[PDB]
Amino acid sequence: SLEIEELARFAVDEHNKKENALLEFVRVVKAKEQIDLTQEWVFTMYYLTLEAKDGGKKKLYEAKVWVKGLTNWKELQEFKPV
Amino acid sequence: NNDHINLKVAGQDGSVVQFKIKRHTPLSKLMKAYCERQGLSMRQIRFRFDGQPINETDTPAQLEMEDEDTIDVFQQ
Numbered sequence: 296s297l298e299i300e301e302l303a304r305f306a307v308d309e310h311n312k313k314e315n316a317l318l319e320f321v322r323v324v325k326a327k328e329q330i331d332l333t334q335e336w337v338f339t340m341y342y343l344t345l346e347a348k349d350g351g352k353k354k355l356y357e358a359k360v361w362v363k364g365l366t367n368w369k370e371l372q373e374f375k376p377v
Numbered sequence: 378n379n380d381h382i383n384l385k386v387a388g389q390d391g392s393v394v395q396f397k398i399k400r401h402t403p404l405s406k407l408m409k410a411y412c413e414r415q416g417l418s419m420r421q422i423r424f425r426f427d428g429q430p431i432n433e434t435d436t437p438a439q440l441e442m443e444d445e446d447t448i449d450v451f452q453q
Contacts, residue, residue, distance in 0.1 A: 330397070330414065332406050367414060368413075
């Protein structure tokens with residue numbers, strides 16, 4: 296959950312930098328880590344539901360964050376509303 | 378796509394670790410990845426599926442595992 300908020304912060308920061316936005320990171324609402332073994336290289340996908348105040352107004356945002364390798368050893372891939 | 382399935386590895390501690398794997402990939406790949414992920418050693422855990430022990434050489438397809446099934450892990 297801590298390691299996951301550090302990811303969610305990064306997702307928000309990249310959404311802002313990729314789209315010139317001023318989103319307000321609140322917290323992680325839902326989170327799944329899935330380890331993908333389908334390729335030569337292991338990677339981990341994060342599927343995050345976080346809420347962020349747009350214009351101060353609370354809204355719910357979906358984020359997919361790609362990670363090379365396993366977590367305990369990064370790139371935003373999608374960021375949308377529900 | 379249908380060659381890929383989602384699997385969960387459930388521990389006695391109530392930890393659930395989720396994997397996407399090809400059906401004909403040996404389960405050894407998932408086991409060793411699970412170990413490294415959880416700070417564990419292979420020589421000290423065993424895997425079961427439907428109460429039966431799992432070989433490293435076995436594939437999901439030989440065990441007729443389907444999307445969303447759970448492998449269980451215990452201390453050896």
